[PDB]
Design a protein around this motif. Structure first.
Motif, PDB file in Angstrom:
ATOM      1  N   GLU A 188       0.865  -1.172   0.000  1.00  9.00           N
ATOM      2  CA  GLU A 188       0.000   0.000   0.000  1.00  9.00           C
ATOM      3  C   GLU A 188       0.904   1.224   0.000  1.00  9.00           C
ATOM      4  O   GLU A 188       0.698   2.170  -0.763  1.00  9.00           O
ATOM      5  N   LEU A 189       1.901   1.187   0.880  1.00  5.67           N
ATOM      6  CA  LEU A 189       2.885   2.253   1.034  1.00  5.67           C
ATOM      7  C   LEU A 189       3.255   2.787  -0.351  1.00  5.67           C
ATOM      8  O   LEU A 189       3.686   3.932  -0.503  1.00  5.67           O
ATOM      9  N   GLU A 190       3.062   1.921  -1.344  1.00  6.76           N
ATOM     10  CA  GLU A 190       3.322   2.178  -2.756  1.00  6.76           C
ATOM     11  C   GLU A 190       2.793   3.536  -3.232  1.00  6.76           C
ATOM     12  O   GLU A 190       2.047   3.607  -4.207  1.00  6.76           O
ATOM     13  N   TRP A 191       3.175   4.607  -2.538  1.00  2.99           N
ATOM     14  CA  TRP A 191       2.762   5.956  -2.916  1.00  2.99           C
ATOM     15  C   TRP A 191       3.108   7.029  -1.894  1.00  2.99           C
ATOM     16  O   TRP A 191       2.551   8.126  -1.934  1.00  2.99           O
ATOM     17  N   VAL A 192       4.040   6.722  -0.997  1.00  2.00           N
ATOM     18  CA  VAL A 192       4.449   7.677   0.029  1.00  2.00           C
ATOM     19  C   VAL A 192       5.479   8.681  -0.510  1.00  2.00           C
ATOM     20  O   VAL A 192       5.784   8.668  -1.698  1.00  2.00           O
ATOM     21  N   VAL A 193       6.011   9.548   0.352  1.00  2.00           N
ATOM     22  CA  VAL A 193       6.970  10.565  -0.088  1.00  2.00           C
ATOM     23  C   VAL A 193       8.104  10.882   0.902  1.00  2.00           C
ATOM     24  O   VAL A 193       7.878  11.007   2.113  1.00  2.00           O
ATOM     25  N   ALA A 194       9.322  11.036   0.379  1.00  2.00           N
ATOM     26  CA  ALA A 194      10.484  11.353   1.218  1.00  2.00           C
ATOM     27  C   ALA A 194      11.498  12.203   0.454  1.00  2.00           C
ATOM     28  O   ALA A 194      11.549  12.156  -0.772  1.00  2.00           O
ATOM     29  N   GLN A 195      12.308  12.976   1.175  1.00  2.00           N
ATOM     30  CA  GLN A 195      13.305  13.837   0.535  1.00  2.00           C
ATOM     31  C   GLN A 195      14.721  13.351   0.827  1.00  2.00           C
ATOM     32  O   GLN A 195      15.084  13.151   1.988  1.00  2.00           O
ATOM     33  N   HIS A 196      15.524  13.175  -0.222  1.00  2.00           N
ATOM     34  CA  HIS A 196      16.884  12.679  -0.046  1.00  2.00           C
ATOM     35  C   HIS A 196      18.019  13.696  -0.105  1.00  2.00           C
ATOM     36  O   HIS A 196      18.051  14.569  -0.971  1.00  2.00           O
ATOM     37  N   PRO A 197      18.990  13.560   0.818  1.00  2.00           N
ATOM     38  CA  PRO A 197      20.187  14.375   1.012  1.00  2.00           C
ATOM     39  C   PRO A 197      20.608  15.268  -0.148  1.00  2.00           C
ATOM     40  O   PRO A 197      19.943  16.256  -0.405  1.00  2.00           O
ATOM     41  N   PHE A 198      21.703  14.921  -0.829  1.00  2.00           N
ATOM     42  CA  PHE A 198      22.241  15.696  -1.960  1.00  2.00           C
ATOM     43  C   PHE A 198      21.679  17.123  -2.109  1.00  2.00           C
ATOM     44  O   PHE A 198      22.434  18.094  -2.103  1.00  2.00           O
ATOM     45  N   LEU A 199      20.364  17.245  -2.251  1.00  2.00           N
ATOM     46  CA  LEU A 199      19.703  18.543  -2.363  1.00  2.00           C
ATOM     47  C   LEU A 199      18.179  18.371  -2.339  1.00  2.00           C
ATOM     48  O   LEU A 199      17.427  19.351  -2.411  1.00  2.00           O
ATOM     49  N   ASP A 200      17.750  17.114  -2.208  1.00  2.00           N
ATOM     50  CA  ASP A 200      16.341  16.707  -2.170  1.00  2.00           C
ATOM     51  C   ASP A 200      15.296  17.681  -2.722  1.00  2.00           C
ATOM     52  O   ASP A 200      14.188  17.785  -2.192  1.00  2.00           O
ATOM     53  N   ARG A 201      15.644  18.395  -3.786  1.00  2.00           N
ATOM     54  CA  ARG A 201      14.688  19.307  -4.402  1.00  2.00           C
ATOM     55  C   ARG A 201      13.937  18.447  -5.415  1.00  2.00           C
ATOM     56  O   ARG A 201      13.772  18.807  -6.582  1.00  2.00           O
ATOM     57  N   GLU A 202      13.512  17.283  -4.928  1.00  2.00           N
ATOM     58  CA  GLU A 202      12.754  16.294  -5.688  1.00  2.00           C
ATOM     59  C   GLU A 202      12.053  15.406  -4.657  1.00  2.00           C
ATOM     60  O   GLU A 202      12.700  14.785  -3.808  1.00  2.00           O
ATOM     61  N   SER A 203      10.730  15.368  -4.723  1.00  2.00           N
ATOM     62  CA  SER A 203       9.951  14.550  -3.809  1.00  2.00           C
ATOM     63  C   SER A 203       9.947  13.107  -4.308  1.00  2.00           C
ATOM     64  O   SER A 203       9.014  12.671  -4.992  1.00  2.00           O
ATOM     65  N   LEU A 204      11.004  12.373  -3.966  1.00  2.00           N
ATOM     66  CA  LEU A 204      11.150  10.981  -4.377  1.00  2.00           C
ATOM     67  C   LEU A 204       9.974  10.109  -3.940  1.00  2.00           C
ATOM     68  O   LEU A 204       9.930   9.623  -2.812  1.00  2.00           O
ATOM     69  N   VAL A 205       9.024   9.900  -4.849  1.00  2.00           N
ATOM     70  CA  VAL A 205       7.846   9.098  -4.540  1.00  2.00           C
ATOM     71  C   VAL A 205       8.138   7.596  -4.388  1.00  2.00           C
ATOM     72  O   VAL A 205       9.292   7.175  -4.305  1.00  2.00           O
ATOM     73  N   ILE A 206       7.074   6.800  -4.346  1.00  2.00           N
ATOM     74  CA  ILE A 206       7.176   5.356  -4.164  1.00  2.00           C
ATOM     75  C   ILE A 206       6.387   4.600  -5.243  1.00  2.00           C
ATOM     76  O   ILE A 206       5.529   5.185  -5.901  1.00  2.00           O
ATOM     77  N   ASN A 207       6.692   3.315  -5.435  1.00  2.00           N
ATOM     78  CA  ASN A 207       5.989   2.487  -6.417  1.00  2.00           C
ATOM     79  C   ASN A 207       6.071   0.994  -6.134  1.00  2.00           C
ATOM     80  O   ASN A 207       6.615   0.558  -5.118  1.00  2.00           O
ATOM     81  N   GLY A 208       5.512   0.216  -7.053  1.00  2.00           N
ATOM     82  CA  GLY A 208       5.529  -1.221  -6.907  1.00  2.00           C
ATOM     83  C   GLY A 208       6.367  -1.881  -7.980  1.00  2.00           C
ATOM     84  O   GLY A 208       6.000  -1.864  -9.153  1.00  2.00           O
ATOM     85  N   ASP A 209       7.495  -2.460  -7.579  1.00  2.00           N
ATOM     86  CA  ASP A 209       8.390  -3.139  -8.518  1.00  2.00           C
ATOM     87  C   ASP A 209       8.252  -4.649  -8.364  1.00  2.00           C
ATOM     88  O   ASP A 209       7.623  -5.131  -7.421  1.00  2.00           O
TER      89      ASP A 209
END
Ligand SMILES: C/C(=C\C(=O)OCCCCCCCCC(=O)O)C[C@@H]1OC[C@H](C[C@@H]2O[C@H]2[C@@H](C)[C@H](C)O)[C@H](O)[C@@H]1O
Ligand SMILES: [Zn+2]
Length: 880
Positions: free
Chosen positions: A291-312
RNA sequence: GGGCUUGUAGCUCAGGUGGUUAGAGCGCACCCCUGAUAAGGGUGAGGUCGGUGGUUCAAGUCCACUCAGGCCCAC
């Protein structure tokens, strides 16, 4: 002897075929008389059946897979031609691609020294040098088709068809530009293709990057933090998401630090890798990545990108079930992302350096300036986790340096649009089976997109030149002129002159108002060339038709020539290329496993035609269930030899036992035959009924069965034998002999035709040795016709033939005790039985002794206890 | 791992709607013929159905699970 004045079988037809010495010569004559066309002549007009040929690659020498395929189509076409349909088969060949190229330098070409045209040709002579090479084989298989004038994807007329498709599509908003990931070696400043890379040990910096969770939605489930494992460093600075495996997750969560998210599968692994078991203090509040398959987190480097989630699909082992995905340097990494409008990070120079998107990364190295880089933002970014190791990382042979995935300008075919228009078609297309519809209806419904361009120099170049500095000229007129040009010269006329003298004579586009023009290089992905069969040939050879009646290829074509054809056909004529679709499995070894030299189990085609001949090969393919992988072994072929041996031998007996017979003059009215003769006549009918129906469903295996059963049980095991006392004794023209010959002439010939498509050579042979047959070649004779059958009769003999089987176990027993030895030596006596009314039954038959090929018999109504009882009456046996 | 798929006698193959001693041909074993002879006839012996567990009174035939294969993606 009393045999001097006897009757015997006489014919030059050998018992032992020797097809290998025989078959060639027989072909050369069909090639002489030029059957193929005359085949079409015969019929002409009438109905029509088209089996469009899928063009095999012009490289290497045919393997079994072909044989099966082509012999299956031959079966199919010949039969048809026999039912009269006007069925012109037109063989095809693939002449573009990359193998054909690699198969050049792997000899000693030396690329750079020539010129595109200086190799196109040098990668075009070879092509044709192959077609011929493989042509002889197909011909060597007795296959029949327009081989003298086949079609080949590199014919000037073909590109024509090639580009228009593209065009028609183009002028329908489908053939756009874009970017996908491709192997790349800065130590060459160019891309590569699998076959161009070998792998070795590289010292990679294994890292478990401490990523942070954030943002309301990306806060829907608590607010701990995110781990993440990646063996490469620079991959990250090209951030876009993270995809777990929805169905197995457990975002764990834990103590001190900042609490961490991963998968249960790894939990320990993680801890076993990060000195975490500083007291295996269990998990808390576990989630569902599913279900989590759609949450959001920001990563170091500069996280000016909302790295979403998916199902692989798949990601177990390694490190944190986080992944870290960048559709820029990961193929499967490319789709999952892309699937939902997700970017294409840092292209990264033709050399190991990037530019845009990279903060300090502007002017870096692909390796070392990715390394100490990992650092800086590690701690000073949120602290992280690191290891060192040796991998299996790819390298470019010839240079042996490393290679990396990079983003690059490419073209594609909007599958998304068409998917549907296709599927709908897929549904309204018939199938020999069923799972095929599924399988393929599913291919498409997961297809994704179609990268339709390669940076190779052998193939129809995509017709696109630029002019406007923004440029991108690709509309009708511009497109067409290319075809209307490619014809007179070929896919060569692109690499021939400059963009200028290739456009709409004196044409000029608003942009680049400088008369300057830059033409694209990229040629098309060969699946297109082939995908354009319904175009360049079906609709362009006056003697065919577009809606081919049925494509016939092997299971790996469900994505290959099947999809790429329908996918293309629709995007032009919004309908299905083929009406019917028959598929066939692969050829395994004996066991049923893959054939490979490294094991020593590969029955190659050629080597077989040379040994047992091709008529054998064919009778084999017929013995199999192509709806699934088929098996071939030397053990298999013998039985295949055996069979062919019996068949051959059996037509041999008849051929010689009709040697003196002549229909026109002799033959007996059906009404005027011996019942037993009628019986078999009918049995020839039943057999003809059941086999033509079999032919109709493409169920040959079923004939290999029947033909066989029929031959042994009906012909040899009986009629033929019983017949000996007639064909050898009675006056050459006694109503009895001529009667049996009358049916045999048919039990023969009529059957000769029924085997024509499966035993092309042998058929013709028996034909050449059959008196007065009215037509040169079995292959130009309509098939026998299906007549109603006097069942009621067939049933009596089924009973009588039963009783027979009994009359034997009675004989053998008696023959075992030596009471007898050669049937004719005994006098049979059976009678009514409480399990069967033998008496009144055997009333209708005649020459019961003859039918039992014994000395005498008698029906008595009753017999005594002494009489050993059987299933169909009371029998007793005695010498003289 | 994902879609689809195959597994019955030495061999190629059959085996609606679950139901007596699981079939066919070939092959093989053996006897017979030697007037189809680098041929021919007769008879017989071989499978418990890849495995395991279920469902039903009853399964080769329906369920699940599993071992071994195959094509195509993922690698
Ligand atoms: C049943 C097949 C192969 C097989 O059964 O494989 C048999 C085993 C391989 C041989 C082993 C050799 C030894 C090497 C080692 O050491 O391992 C596949 C068939 O092939 C013929 C055609 C090929 C063309 O591609 C098709 C088309 C329509 C497209 C436009 O190009 C046919 O359409 C089909 O594809
Ligand atoms: Zn190495």
């Amino acid at each position: 002897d009393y045999e001097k004045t006897l009757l015997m079988p006489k014919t030059d037809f050998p018992m032992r075929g020797g097809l290998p010495n025989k078959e060639p010569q027989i072909q050369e004559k069909w090639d002489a008389e030029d059957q193929y066309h005359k085949a079409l002549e015969k019929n002409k007009g009438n109905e029509t059946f088209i089996l469009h040929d899928g063009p095999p690659y012009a490289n290497g020498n045919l393997h079994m897979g072909h044989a099966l395929n082509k012999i299956l189509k031959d079966f199919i076409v010949r039969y048809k031609t026999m039912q009269g349909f006007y069925a012109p088969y037109v063989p095809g060949w693939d002449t573009h691609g990359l193998p054909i190229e690699q198969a050049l330098t792997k000899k000693g070409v030396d690329r750079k020294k020539m010129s595109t045209a200086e190799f196109r040709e040098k990668c075009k002579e070879f092509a044709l040098e192959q077609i011929e090479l493989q042509k002889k084989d197909f011909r060597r298989l007795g296959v029949r088709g327009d081989f003298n004038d086949p079609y080949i994807t590199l014919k000037p007329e073909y590109e024509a068809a090639q580009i228009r498709i593209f065009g028609e599509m183009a002028d329908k908003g489908l053939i756009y530009k874009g970017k996908k990931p491709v192997y790349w070696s800065p130590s060459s400043e160019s891309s590569l293709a699998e076959a161009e890379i070998e792998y070795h040990d590289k010292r990679s910096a294994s890292i478990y990057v401490a990523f942070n969770v954030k943002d309301d939605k990306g806060v829907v489930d608590a607010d701990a933090k995110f781990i993440i494992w990646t063996t490469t460093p620079w991959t990250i600075p090209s951030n876009v998401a993270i995809t777990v495996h929805p169905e197995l997750k457990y975002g764990q969560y834990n103590v001190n630090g900042e609490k961490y998210i991963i998968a249960e599968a790894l939990s320990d692994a993680v801890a076993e890798a990060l000195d975490w078991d500083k007291a295996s203090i269990k998990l808390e509040k576990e989630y569902t990545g599913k279900e989590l398959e759609w949450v959001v987190a920001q990563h170091p480097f500069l996280d000016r990108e909302s790295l979403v989630i998916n199902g692989d699909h798949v990601t177990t082992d390694a490190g944190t079930g986080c992944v870290h995905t960048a559709p820029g340097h990961g193929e499967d990494d490319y789709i999952v992302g892309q699937q939902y409008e997700l970017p294409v990070i840092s292209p990264i120079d033709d050399k190991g350096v990037f530019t845009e998107e990279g903060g300090q990364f502007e002017g870096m190295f692909y390796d070392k300036a990715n390394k100490a880089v990992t650092d800086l933002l590690t701690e000073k970014g949120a602290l992280l986790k690191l290891d060192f190791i040796t991998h299996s990382y790819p390298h470019d042979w010839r240079t042996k340096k490393p290679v990396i995935f990079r983003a690059t300008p490419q073209w594609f075919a909007s599958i998304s649009k068409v998917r549907q228009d296709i599927l709908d078609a897929i549904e309204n297309t018939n199938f020999k089976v069923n799972w095929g519809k599924t399988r393929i209806y599913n291919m498409v419904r997961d297809r994704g997109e179609w990268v339709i361009s390669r940076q190779r120099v052998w193939g129809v170049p995509l017709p696109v030149f630029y002019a406007e500095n923004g440029e991108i000229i690709m509309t009708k007129e511009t497109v067409n002129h290319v075809a209307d040009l490619f014809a007179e010269h070929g896919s060569n006329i692109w690499f021939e002159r400059e963009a200028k003298d290739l456009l709409p004579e004196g044409f000029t586009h608003p942009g680049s108002p400088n008369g300057t023009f830059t033409k694209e290089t990229d040629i098309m992905d060969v699946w297109f060339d082939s995908g354009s069969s319904h175009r360049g040939v079906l609709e362009t050879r006056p003697e065919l038709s577009f809606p081919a009646d049925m494509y016939l290829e092997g299971s790996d074509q469900y994505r290959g020539w099947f999809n790429s054809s329908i996918t293309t056909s629709v995007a032009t004529r919004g309908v299905s290329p083929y009406k019917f679709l028959l598929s066939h499995g692969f050829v395994m070894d004996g066991e049923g496993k893959k054939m490979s030299k490294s094991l020593g189990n590969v029955i190659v085609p050629d080597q077989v035609v040379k040994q047992k001949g091709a008529d054998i090969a064919r009778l084999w393919v017929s013995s199999t269930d192509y709806l699934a992988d088929v098996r071939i072994s030397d053990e298999i072929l013998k039985q295949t030899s055996d069979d062919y041996r019996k068949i051959r031998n059996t037509l041999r007996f008849m051929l010689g036992n009709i040697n003196d017979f002549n229909p026109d003059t002799d033959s007996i009215p059906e009404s005027e035959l011996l019942e037993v003769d009628r019986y078999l006549l009918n049995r020839l009918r039943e057999f003809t009924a059941s086999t033509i129906n079999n032919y109709e469903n493409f169920d040959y295996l079923n004939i290999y069965q029947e033909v066989q059963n029929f031959i042994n049980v009906e012909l040899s095991n009986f009629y033929l034998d019983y017949g000996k006392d007639i064909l050898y004794i009675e006056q050459r023209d006694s109503h009895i002999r001529r009667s049996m010959q009358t049916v045999l002439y048919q039990i023969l010939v009529d059957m000769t035709k029924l085997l024509a498509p499966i035993l092309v050579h042998t058929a013709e042979e028996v034909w050449s040795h059959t008196p007065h047959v009215k037509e040169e070649s079995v292959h130009l004779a309509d098939m026998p016709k299906v007549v109603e059958v006097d069942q009621a009769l067939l049933d009596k003999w089924r009973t009588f033939m039963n009783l027979r089987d009994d009359v034997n176990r009675a004989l053998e027993t008696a023959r075992n005790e030596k009471v007898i030895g050669k049937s004719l030596e005994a006098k049979v006596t059976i009678a009514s039985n409480d399990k069967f009314n033998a008496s009144e039954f055997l009333t209708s038959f005649d020459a019961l002794h003859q039918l039992f090929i014994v000395s005498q018999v008698k029906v008595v109504d009753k017999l005594d206890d002494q009489a050993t009882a059987y299933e169909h009456g009371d029998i007793v046996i005695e010498h003289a």
